[PDB]
Write a protein that binds this ligand. Structure first.
Ligand SMILES: [Mg+2]
Ligand SMILES: [Mg+2]
Ligand SMILES: [Mg+2]
Ligand SMILES: [Mg+2]
Ligand SMILES: [Mg+2]
Ligand SMILES: [Mg+2]
Ligand SMILES: [Mg+2]
Ligand SMILES: [Mg+2]
Ligand SMILES: [Mg+2]
Ligand SMILES: [Mg+2]
Ligand SMILES: [Mg+2]
Ligand SMILES: [Mg+2]
Ligand SMILES: [Mg+2]
Ligand SMILES: [Mg+2]
Ligand SMILES: [Mg+2]
Ligand SMILES: [Mg+2]
Ligand SMILES: [Mg+2]
Ligand SMILES: [Mg+2]
Ligand SMILES: [Mg+2]
Ligand SMILES: [Mg+2]
Ligand SMILES: [Mg+2]
Ligand SMILES: [Mg+2]
Ligand SMILES: [Mg+2]
Ligand SMILES: [Mg+2]
Ligand SMILES: [Mg+2]
Ligand SMILES: [Mg+2]
Ligand SMILES: [Mg+2]
Ligand SMILES: [Mg+2]
Ligand SMILES: [Mg+2]
Ligand SMILES: [Mg+2]
Ligand SMILES: [Mg+2]
Ligand SMILES: [Mg+2]
Ligand SMILES: [Mg+2]
Ligand SMILES: [Mg+2]
Ligand SMILES: [Mg+2]
Ligand SMILES: [Mg+2]
Ligand SMILES: [Mg+2]
Ligand SMILES: [Mg+2]
Ligand SMILES: [Mg+2]
Ligand SMILES: [Mg+2]
Ligand SMILES: [Mg+2]
Ligand SMILES: [Mg+2]
Ligand SMILES: [Mg+2]
Ligand SMILES: [Mg+2]
Ligand SMILES: [Mg+2]
Ligand SMILES: [Mg+2]
Ligand SMILES: [Mg+2]
Ligand SMILES: [Mg+2]
Ligand SMILES: [Mg+2]
Ligand SMILES: [Mg+2]
Ligand SMILES: [Mg+2]
Ligand SMILES: [Mg+2]
Ligand SMILES: [Mg+2]
Ligand SMILES: [Mg+2]
Ligand SMILES: [Mg+2]
Ligand SMILES: [Mg+2]
Ligand SMILES: [Mg+2]
Ligand SMILES: [Mg+2]
Ligand SMILES: [Mg+2]
Ligand SMILES: [Mg+2]
Ligand SMILES: [Mg+2]
Ligand SMILES: [Mg+2]
Ligand SMILES: [Mg+2]
Ligand SMILES: [Mg+2]
Ligand SMILES: [Mg+2]
Ligand SMILES: [Mg+2]
Ligand SMILES: [Mg+2]
Ligand SMILES: [Mg+2]
Ligand SMILES: [Mg+2]
Ligand SMILES: [Mg+2]
Ligand SMILES: [Mg+2]
Ligand SMILES: [Mg+2]
Ligand SMILES: [Mg+2]
Ligand SMILES: [Mg+2]
Ligand SMILES: [Mg+2]
Ligand SMILES: [Mg+2]
Ligand SMILES: [Mg+2]
Ligand SMILES: [Mg+2]
Ligand SMILES: [Mg+2]
Ligand SMILES: [Mg+2]
Ligand SMILES: [Mg+2]
Ligand SMILES: [Mg+2]
Ligand SMILES: [Mg+2]
Ligand SMILES: [Mg+2]
Ligand SMILES: [Mg+2]
Ligand SMILES: [Mg+2]
Ligand SMILES: [Mg+2]
Ligand SMILES: [Mg+2]
Ligand SMILES: [Mg+2]
Ligand SMILES: [Mg+2]
Ligand SMILES: [Mg+2]
Ligand SMILES: [Mg+2]
Ligand SMILES: [Mg+2]
Ligand SMILES: [Mg+2]
Ligand SMILES: [Mg+2]
Ligand SMILES: [Mg+2]
Ligand SMILES: [Mg+2]
Ligand SMILES: [Mg+2]
Ligand SMILES: [Mg+2]
Ligand SMILES: [Mg+2]
Ligand SMILES: [Mg+2]
Ligand SMILES: [Mg+2]
Ligand SMILES: [Mg+2]
Ligand SMILES: [Mg+2]
Ligand SMILES: [Mg+2]
Ligand SMILES: [Mg+2]
Ligand SMILES: [Mg+2]
Ligand SMILES: [Mg+2]
Ligand SMILES: [Mg+2]
Ligand SMILES: [Mg+2]
Ligand SMILES: [Mg+2]
Ligand SMILES: [Mg+2]
Ligand SMILES: [Mg+2]
Ligand SMILES: [Mg+2]
Ligand SMILES: [Mg+2]
Ligand SMILES: [Mg+2]
Ligand SMILES: [Mg+2]
Ligand SMILES: [Mg+2]
Ligand SMILES: [Mg+2]
Ligand SMILES: [Mg+2]
Ligand SMILES: [Mg+2]
Ligand SMILES: [Mg+2]
Ligand SMILES: [Mg+2]
Ligand SMILES: [Mg+2]
Ligand SMILES: [Mg+2]
Ligand SMILES: [Mg+2]
Ligand SMILES: [Mg+2]
Ligand SMILES: [Mg+2]
Ligand SMILES: [Mg+2]
Ligand SMILES: [Mg+2]
Ligand SMILES: [Mg+2]
Ligand SMILES: [Mg+2]
Ligand SMILES: [Mg+2]
Ligand SMILES: [Mg+2]
Ligand SMILES: [Mg+2]
Ligand SMILES: [Mg+2]
Ligand SMILES: [Mg+2]
Ligand SMILES: [Mg+2]
Ligand SMILES: [Mg+2]
Ligand SMILES: [Mg+2]
Ligand SMILES: [Mg+2]
Ligand SMILES: [Mg+2]
Ligand SMILES: [Mg+2]
Ligand SMILES: [Mg+2]
Ligand SMILES: [Mg+2]
Ligand SMILES: [Mg+2]
Ligand SMILES: [Mg+2]
Ligand SMILES: [Mg+2]
Ligand SMILES: [Mg+2]
Ligand SMILES: [Mg+2]
Ligand SMILES: [Mg+2]
Ligand SMILES: [Mg+2]
Lengths: 120, 122, 55, 114, 211
RNA sequence: UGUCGGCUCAUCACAUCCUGGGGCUGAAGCCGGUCCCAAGGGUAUGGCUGUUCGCCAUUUAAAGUGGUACGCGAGCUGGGUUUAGAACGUCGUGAGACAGUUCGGUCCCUAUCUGCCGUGGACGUUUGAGAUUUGAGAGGGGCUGCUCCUAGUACGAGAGGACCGGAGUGGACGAACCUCUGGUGUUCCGGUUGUCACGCCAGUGGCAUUGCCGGGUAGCUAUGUUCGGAAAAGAUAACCGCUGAAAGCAUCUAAGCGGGAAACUUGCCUCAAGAUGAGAUCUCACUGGGAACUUGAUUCCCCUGAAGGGCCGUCGAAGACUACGACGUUGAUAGGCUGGGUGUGUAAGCGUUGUGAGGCGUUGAGCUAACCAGUACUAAUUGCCCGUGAGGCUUGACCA
RNA sequence: CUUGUCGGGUAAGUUCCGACCUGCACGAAUGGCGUAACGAUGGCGGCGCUGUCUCCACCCGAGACUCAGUGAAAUUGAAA
RNA sequence: AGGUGGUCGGGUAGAGAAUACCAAGGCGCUUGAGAGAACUCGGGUGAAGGAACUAGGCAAAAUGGCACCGUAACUUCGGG
RNA sequence: AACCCACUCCCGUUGAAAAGGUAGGGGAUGACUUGUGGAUCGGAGUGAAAGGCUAAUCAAGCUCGGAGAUAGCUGGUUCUC
RNA sequence: AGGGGAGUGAAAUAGAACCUGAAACCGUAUGCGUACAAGCAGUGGGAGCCUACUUGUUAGGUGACUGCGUACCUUUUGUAU
């Protein structure tokens, strides 16, 4: 049974999952638009959106907290300087998921993940 | 809860130090004995000149248990060890003194004597 | 464990009476007139009347 | 759960002065042997505390007669007539379950003076 | 039985008596029930009353159901239930509240039990396992034997096997009503009630009762 | 056609071990003996031994007897037995032997058909659809101890000690549940060892079984909580009768009328119209033309496709896939966001004290999963497909 | 014969240890009786420890399950 | 997932060529994606008991280092 | 520790493997382990002896001949009236 | 890769895996039958429907319903076994 439980195992150890979603979050903040699997995209929004909300106020303790969760100086620089200021007045929902078919290799469902107000 | 081959100490001065449960009385296939339950024990260790001897089969009542006893408001009382009181043929205590605290559910008709002898009732 | 008798032509064709395939839900994007999967982004890159990825 | 919280809120009127794990408290319990109504004192150190509104509870431990005894009290039960904090202790944890393996001088709780 | 209400299981709590006794209690919200159809000997065969409770959107109510809810000016609710009454008189439009129950009043509660998906014989039928050591080979929680040899030489119907500890309907009999809250529309019942929080429950006077 | 014993799971008989109903007794009472009726439910744990068995110890209301390949190895085991090694006693000149001992010794198979446990797809139920139902039938369940009052009464010289009737509290078994008591809780918070890295200090992160540990939310769960077995009716078994002749009497029987048990039929719970004998009730939808006939339950063409169902999406205490349940902007379905709650336990930085480890303040701080309430910020499109166009005939009664 | 009889150990010991001699059918280099140390050797008994068990519960990974690709096997007189 | 002679073999801990985390150097093991049933495999924790399991403590749990104190019967005088 | 071995459990048994793997286990300066080259063989060799080993074959190897050995024993034996 | 036309040839369904091209086995199309029915699947009776034409004492295809009916070989005193 699984009653009232949240989170997907995704056939990985819990240490593998932590590293993988930490990699996706860094990629999303830099490239502004990535393509991944649909189940993975629905678990990424529970990891990267708390980081954008955390970056809405700039302080030494907050930039240290962000670095402990994304071990990337560039990702912490992209937040606190571009994101969090762009989403200052936006109350949640900073990213969007759109289904985009299946891969040829394994017929895996795919989706796009992009930030809401890309400057393009 | 006490079952067969559980080891528990004696809360009396009957001369026994350790007894081992060999039967839980009062029902077919009965499994556990709690505070106030009659069991059948064997003496495993004794004083040189006590009034019980090693290897003697007899009856005891559970007085103090590690599992505990629950009350009507949901509260529970627990002790650090399991203890018993050895009884004679007519279900009366063999010793004359009782060591350690007891509980208020021992104040039945046939165990009121050992409640009055206890230094404390909880 | 294995069969004591070999299956007949009819017997194994009744088992396959459930092997048929279902169709997908397709839609036509009225702005362009292009056929796409329902609730998906079109191969061009449109969804609900907007450009999203532009190849 | 919004209307369960209101059922429980009407039964919470006792004062319950603040206490913490590691404190030495005296609990006055109600005993009704026969028809008489007396109060019995249970004094010991608070080792655990459960903060669940009307389902709150705490555990106190004492050495009675060479035997250690632990009682878990339901905070809002009418059996708990009153409570008072005799002393305050200085500990780092929420649950002091390690005290069960210490007996004499080893199980002393340092006092929080300030 | 023969008359009752339809409620929702809100959850569990406790109440303390002045003597220091804790009563386990299940809270049931009973939104007032509206009579939709009355069935008599001549019109329908048997004799019963039809009831609805709750609310539904206009877009989720079909035209067949909407016209049934318009013959009795009742307005649509979630679900429709029936109570087989012995000899009572009702009209299409009457209200049925927590007021037909009092403190005491042993009652029966029906609900849909929590659903385990696909259970083995140990969990479903309380079988006992084989050895976990002493040479056992990949047969720790397996059922064992399921029949006998040439004689009958088949498995008897009703043999206890594995699968679907169900989300079935079960009744719990002779539960005591502790408190009836008329203004909040609540029934407080001592004990446990089948189902999860937010499920549908049916409360009726106890069939056996007596003592 | 795999041969003992053990484990797991059983099913039937009655020549009945307990509980239930009776006759006789060399039946005062409490206990017994024997026979008749009765198969609903129950019917130990261990020490020894490979043991079935048996003997012991301690329980229980009782620890029933048998059939099912001495039930059950394509369900497990491998102690015994019956391969190959080695030894003892005995027998043989010897190779060797023993239905005599002793130590050691590989247990294969992905389930086609019948069967069984669950869960679906198709069609039918005579126009179609949404919902609520009756109950032919079938399953589940059915155990029992002790104490108190009657009453120290009946009975008995005394010792002792009831029937009938009522109240309470247990054991075993079963179901549901998570308020409480606990367990778990690699998705929460801390402590700490070794090493590498983030330029460095500080602070953090990877790896070491989750590195090792201390706690712990929701969910699940028992050892925790609540409930259950009934009462009652009917027809009976053995048994006890009323009236009553054949047979002036007697006689439960030949006519007639009764009492009578955990057995049977209900009553309690669950499934149940594929019950093809396919049942019932409420409501809803559809009210167009033409041609060919092999001239009526016929075929074809054009128009028109309703009530409703499905596909799809957001999900769920529902779930192997299904199915079931809620919602899809006229929206709180999921995620986020905002508050709270819960857990952990006084973060970082800074300021002081100290040569330093460390302490003290800011500070019950900081962080916080699944929980509660609110909120359209993000995602649930502006769609497609099925399903039609008033529902045959015969007979009877109402009706015009 | 035989679970011989007696004693010890257990609440209870067909195994164990100490004796008795009635050696079915011991016995002196196919050596007799002892023996410190040694043994992945046989039997028995204790302390600690524990999911071995009462009686299982929860959690984590790999299968099982579904989707896409590739694609066996023993067996088989015919099967409504 | 087997076997195959010889040579070199750094840093931090460490007695060490053990072990752990790294260097130079090399690799992620030629089907993937989901979901989170029974059951199987490999593990973690477990209330109250503590061998009651079983042919048998099988398996698991437990002990484990360095310095110092201290250590029995018996002995072939080394030992134990 | 390396190296040589193979006592226990489990898995695997259509195996990753026609004898393995993960956990534990024994010896580990010697009656040790190992590379290269060489010698002994079919009623023969070699054997700290198990009837063991002599190319996945051993109470007498493989191969080719006598040879279509012999089979009072199983199996089979084909169109019509 | 493989095809659709066009061309050569007497003939490409003689196209190079090339004469002829059977059976097992696998498909597409049409006609009739089949979702309340129990078993060596046939045989005797038999309605209905479809096709053809000689327009029903005919031919061909299906077979609702119903009586009867436990493969073949071998070996045996004896086999559905
Ligand atoms: Mg959720
Ligand atoms: Mg790790
Ligand atoms: Mg078959
Ligand atoms: Mg066969
Ligand atoms: Mg079939
Ligand atoms: Mg198929
Ligand atoms: Mg359930
Ligand atoms: Mg479920
Ligand atoms: Mg078992
Ligand atoms: Mg085995
Ligand atoms: Mg095996
Ligand atoms: Mg196993
Ligand atoms: Mg079998
Ligand atoms: Mg049969
Ligand atoms: Mg069964
Ligand atoms: Mg067989
Ligand atoms: Mg069993
Ligand atoms: Mg029978
Ligand atoms: Mg009888
Ligand atoms: Mg007899
Ligand atoms: Mg009997
Ligand atoms: Mg009887
Ligand atoms: Mg009698
Ligand atoms: Mg019976
Ligand atoms: Mg019986
Ligand atoms: Mg029966
Ligand atoms: Mg019967
Ligand atoms: Mg009955
Ligand atoms: Mg036993
Ligand atoms: Mg026994
Ligand atoms: Mg034995
Ligand atoms: Mg039997
Ligand atoms: Mg028989
Ligand atoms: Mg027999
Ligand atoms: Mg047998
Ligand atoms: Mg038997
Ligand atoms: Mg087996
Ligand atoms: Mg067997
Ligand atoms: Mg097997
Ligand atoms: Mg078989
Ligand atoms: Mg098997
Ligand atoms: Mg053996
Ligand atoms: Mg063995
Ligand atoms: Mg031999
Ligand atoms: Mg001789
Ligand atoms: Mg061996
Ligand atoms: Mg042997
Ligand atoms: Mg068959
Ligand atoms: Mg019926
Ligand atoms: Mg039927
Ligand atoms: Mg019945
Ligand atoms: Mg039944
Ligand atoms: Mg009864
Ligand atoms: Mg019983
Ligand atoms: Mg129970
Ligand atoms: Mg349960
Ligand atoms: Mg709980
Ligand atoms: Mg809780
Ligand atoms: Mg560095
Ligand atoms: Mg540093
Ligand atoms: Mg570190
Ligand atoms: Mg690293
Ligand atoms: Mg750890
Ligand atoms: Mg450790
Ligand atoms: Mg801990
Ligand atoms: Mg933890
Ligand atoms: Mg915990
Ligand atoms: Mg919990
Ligand atoms: Mg008479
Ligand atoms: Mg008379
Ligand atoms: Mg007369
Ligand atoms: Mg008569
Ligand atoms: Mg129907
Ligand atoms: Mg109908
Ligand atoms: Mg419509
Ligand atoms: Mg629907
Ligand atoms: Mg789902
Ligand atoms: Mg749906
Ligand atoms: Mg709103
Ligand atoms: Mg919400
Ligand atoms: Mg929050
Ligand atoms: Mg808090
Ligand atoms: Mg501080
Ligand atoms: Mg600070
Ligand atoms: Mg920290
Ligand atoms: Mg302070
Ligand atoms: Mg806090
Ligand atoms: Mg003998
Ligand atoms: Mg003897
Ligand atoms: Mg003896
Ligand atoms: Mg033994
Ligand atoms: Mg001599
Ligand atoms: Mg000799
Ligand atoms: Mg000797
Ligand atoms: Mg050796
Ligand atoms: Mg020895
Ligand atoms: Mg023993
Ligand atoms: Mg596949
Ligand atoms: Mg090194
Ligand atoms: Mg070391
Ligand atoms: Mg190494
Ligand atoms: Mg490198
Ligand atoms: Mg996967
Ligand atoms: Mg798993
Ligand atoms: Mg496991
Ligand atoms: Mg463990
Ligand atoms: Mg834990
Ligand atoms: Mg434990
Ligand atoms: Mg713990
Ligand atoms: Mg413990
Ligand atoms: Mg212990
Ligand atoms: Mg034993
Ligand atoms: Mg046993
Ligand atoms: Mg071991
Ligand atoms: Mg270990
Ligand atoms: Mg020694
Ligand atoms: Mg080598
Ligand atoms: Mg192991
Ligand atoms: Mg090894
Ligand atoms: Mg080694
Ligand atoms: Mg050695
Ligand atoms: Mg050499
Ligand atoms: Mg040679
Ligand atoms: Mg030769
Ligand atoms: Mg030999
Ligand atoms: Mg060769
Ligand atoms: Mg060889
Ligand atoms: Mg010749
Ligand atoms: Mg020949
Ligand atoms: Mg033959
Ligand atoms: Mg031409
Ligand atoms: Mg041709
Ligand atoms: Mg040709
Ligand atoms: Mg060809
Ligand atoms: Mg030619
Ligand atoms: Mg050809
Ligand atoms: Mg052909
Ligand atoms: Mg076909
Ligand atoms: Mg066809
Ligand atoms: Mg029928
Ligand atoms: Mg039919
Ligand atoms: Mg059939
Ligand atoms: Mg014919
Ligand atoms: Mg014809
Ligand atoms: Mg025919
Ligand atoms: Mg026929
Ligand atoms: Mg026939
Ligand atoms: Mg024969
Ligand atoms: Mg014969
Ligand atoms: Mg045959
Ligand atoms: Mg015949
Ligand atoms: Mg045959």
């Amino acid at each position: 049974m699984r009653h009232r439980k949240s989170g997907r195992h995704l056939s990985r150890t819990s240490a593998h999952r932590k590293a993988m979603f930490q990699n996706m979050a860094v990629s999303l903040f830099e490239h502004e638009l990535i393509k991944t699997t649909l189940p993975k995209a629905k678990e990424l929004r529970r990891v990267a959106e708390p980081l954008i909300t955390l970056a809405k106020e700039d302080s030494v303790a907050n930039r240290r907290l962000a670095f402990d969760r994304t071990r990337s100086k560039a990702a912490v620089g992209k937040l606190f300087n571009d994101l969090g200021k762009r989403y200052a007045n936006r109350p949640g929902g900073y990213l969007r998921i759109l289904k985009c078919g299946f891969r040829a290799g394994d017929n895996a469902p795919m989706a796009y993940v992009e930030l809401v107000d890309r400057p393009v | 809860m006490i079952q067969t081959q559980s080891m528990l100490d004696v809360a009396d001065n009957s001369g026994a130090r350790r007894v081992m449960c060999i039967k839980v009385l009062g029902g077919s296939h009965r499994r556990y004995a709690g505070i106030g339950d009659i069991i059948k024990v064997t003496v495993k260790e004794a004083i040189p000149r006590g009034k019980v001897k090693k290897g003697q089969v007899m009856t005891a009542v559970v007085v103090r248990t590690k599992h505990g006893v629950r009350r009507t408001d949901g509260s529970i009382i627990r002790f650090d060890g399991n203890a018993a009181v050895l009884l004679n043929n007519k279900q009366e205590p063999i010793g004359t003194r009782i060591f350690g605290p007891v509980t208020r559910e021992l104040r039945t008709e046939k165990f009121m004597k050992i409640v009055s002898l206890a230094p404390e009732v909880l | 464990a294995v069969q004591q008798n070999k299956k007949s032509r009819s017997a194994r064709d009744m088992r396959r009476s459930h092997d048929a395939l279902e169709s997908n839900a397709l839609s036509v994007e009225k702005s362009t007139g292009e056929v796409h999967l329902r609730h998906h982004v079109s191969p061009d890159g449109f969804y609900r009347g907007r450009k999203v990825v532009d190849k | 759960n919004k209307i369960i919280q209101q059922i429980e809120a009407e039964q919470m009127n006792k004062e319950i002065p603040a206490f913490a794990p590691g404190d030495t408290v005296i609990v006055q319990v109600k005993v009704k042997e026969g028809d008489r109504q007396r109060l019995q004192a249970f004094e010991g150190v608070v080792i655990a505390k459960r903060n669940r509104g009307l389902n709150s509870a705490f555990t106190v431990r004492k050495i009675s007669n060479g035997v250690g005894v632990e009682r878990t009290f339901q905070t809002y039960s009418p059996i708990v007539d009153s409570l008072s904090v005799k002393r305050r202790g200085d500990v780092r944890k929420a649950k002091l379950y390690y005290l069960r393996a210490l007996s004499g001088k080893a199980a002393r709780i340092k006092e929080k003076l300030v | 039985m023969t008359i009752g209400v339809v409620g929702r299981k809100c959850g569990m709590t406790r109440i303390f008596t002045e003597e220091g006794v804790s009563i386990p209690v299940t809270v049931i919200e009973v939104e007032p029930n509206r009579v939709t159809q009355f069935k008599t000997e001549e019109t329908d065969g048997y004799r019963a009353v039809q009831v609805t409770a709750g609310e539904r959107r206009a877009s989720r109510v079909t035209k067949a159901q909407a016209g049934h809810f318009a013959k009795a000016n009742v307005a649509a609710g979630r679900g429709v239930w029936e109570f087989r009454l012995g000899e009572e008189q009702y009209a299409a439009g009457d209200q049925i509240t927590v007021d037909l129950f009092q403190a005491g009043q042993m009652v029966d509660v029906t609900g849909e039990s929590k659903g385990k998906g696909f259970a083995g014989t140990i969990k479903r039928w309380n079988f006992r396992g084989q050895d976990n050591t002493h040479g056992n080979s990949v047969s720790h929680r397996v059922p064992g034997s399921i029949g006998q040899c040439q004689t009958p030489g088949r498995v008897f119907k009703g043999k206890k096997m594995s699968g679907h500890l169900g989300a079935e309907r079960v009744t719990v009999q002779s539960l005591e009503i502790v408190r009836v809250d008329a203004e909040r529309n609540l029934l407080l019942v001592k004990g446990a009630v089948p189902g999860a929080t937010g499920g549908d429950v049916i409360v009726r006077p106890a069939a056996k009762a007596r003592g």
